[PDB]
UniProtKB/Swiss-Prot annotation:
Domain of life: Eukaryota
Protein name, per record: PAN2-PAN3 deadenylation complex catalytic subunit pan2
Subunit structure and binding partners: Forms a heterotrimer with an asymmetric homodimer of the regulatory subunit par-2/pan3 to form the poly(A)-nuclease (PAN) deadenylation complex.
Lineage of the organism: Eukaryota, Fungi, Dikarya, Ascomycota, Pezizomycotina
Organism: Neurospora crassa (strain ATCC 24698 / 74-OR23-1A / CBS 708.71 / DSM 1257 / FGSC 987)
Stretches assigned to the USP domain: 8-383
Amino acid sequence: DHWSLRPEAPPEYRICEIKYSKFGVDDFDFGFFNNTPYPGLENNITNSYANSLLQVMHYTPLLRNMALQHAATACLADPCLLCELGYVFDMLQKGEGPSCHATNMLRALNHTSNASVSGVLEDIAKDKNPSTLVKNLTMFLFDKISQDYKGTPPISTELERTLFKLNQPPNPLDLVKRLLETDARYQIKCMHCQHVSPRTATTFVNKLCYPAQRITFSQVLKAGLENEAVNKGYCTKCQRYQNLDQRKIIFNIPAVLALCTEITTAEHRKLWSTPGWLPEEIGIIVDQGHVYCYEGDDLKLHLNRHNITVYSLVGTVVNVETKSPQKSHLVATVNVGRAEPESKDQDRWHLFNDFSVRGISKVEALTFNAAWKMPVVVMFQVKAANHRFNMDWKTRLDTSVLFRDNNPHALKTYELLDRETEIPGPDTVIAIDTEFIRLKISHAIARASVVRGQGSREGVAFIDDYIHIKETIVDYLTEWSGITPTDLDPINSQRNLVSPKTAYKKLWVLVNLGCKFLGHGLSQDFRVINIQVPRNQVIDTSIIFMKPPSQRKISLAFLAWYLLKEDIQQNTHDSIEDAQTALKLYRKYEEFMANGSFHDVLEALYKKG
Ligand SMILES: [Zn+2]
Ligand SMILES: [Zn+2]
């Protein structure tokens, strides 16, 4: 009937391999694995286990908004996982192609504090099981982005204010706590003199708890949130060690409810394999330090009769086992309808097996198999937050990073944008080109040049950032890029050497400002830059000068030689020059189209080898 009923993982659930060539990743047919408007994530990256989690979080409206409202600020923190989260979320909502990738964000994770000791790095972590890794990451991320959010005031808290029906705008500290934390504390009572003493409790992600017939998910959730225990400890009142009654007094439940299944035994898998065991909708009651959860018709009855906060199931991080050779990898089954305008079709579940995306039924999404298909992380959010969004992060996007000057050297190869006269917009055209280096084939941006495409200073660069790469560079590609170790050396560089996220922030802002990116073969640049740019914001000269059927692209050097009569390969490649070259080529294209000679020129371009 459906895939999850099979004794083994069907090809739709198996690991998807990327096949490589000399051309590289770009020639690989990602479109074969995804025919949906919902892009997947590529899995040829270190710590790519995060893909399933990133997907589930992205289609959680409160989480996506949270990240975007922060990323749109003037935050120059690097590494900063919340900013990186905003970038990835932005790519997943902008992406017109079949696949995206979170290279920059997984690289930044590797540099994040306490990452090497939180078991979130598959090369360092003790337990290298993907299910364990994504459990730790879920806890690690929720903790990190919570303090990242309060670091600098977000662009807008208007969504949350409306959601929580507040009158005055809430402050970040109280807000992020209501969104992610389970407000609670431990009441430690001496069982002799009945003396009570409090112990603070911090909880971002909760863990399910199982007993040991008719065991429900609501009961397992309730058992997980609460915590009653008895341990011997000293009592200050009666001056001796007594039995202490310790109960977790619960005050508030988070707007975003992340849950770890903690499946360890065979009995746990038998329980989860029960058809219809996982409800897509739950209601939780917090009364006098206790938590009461309801589901199904039992939930409907209580609602007809109180403090019942209805939660909607967003998605599930699922562990998929393969019998031979024995292993495991993660996929994501998500209802993408939660983050979309409300329609009649509420059931919009999709399978996110890395870059392989497929639509599935509610049954399949809520069906689990004790042999190979088991849930790891379950994501709920308040139903009132469904189909909600806020565009103030884009409307009031902070652009200070474009105008700020922190370059010590007086000799620059760029002239920054004037804050008054040169404010980028939808009509603004910019020419861009980058330079690559080799990492321990893995490429990385070593230099990014953006050039004015119009105005009196047309051709003059306003961005020429060199990247302080915190990785090990195998090859500088000096013949190909003209990049020397001195240019990237923080002590001896004469360049505007900046952090990776600092330079990325500029480009990310320019995209959301609506700017049109002009260049030659920009698809390779954007991939290594790790960004997604809409088609109507891309002016590519390699695409422009194609004769329609051939699909073969002309070199930048040949176009410059034939249309501009220039030799641009004399010295080593310079990203500013190559950007100016592409801009010149586009201006020639405008001339050819205007006088109606473009057809003849295009024909002339294709005559010999
Ligand atoms: Zn940030
Ligand atoms: Zn006592």
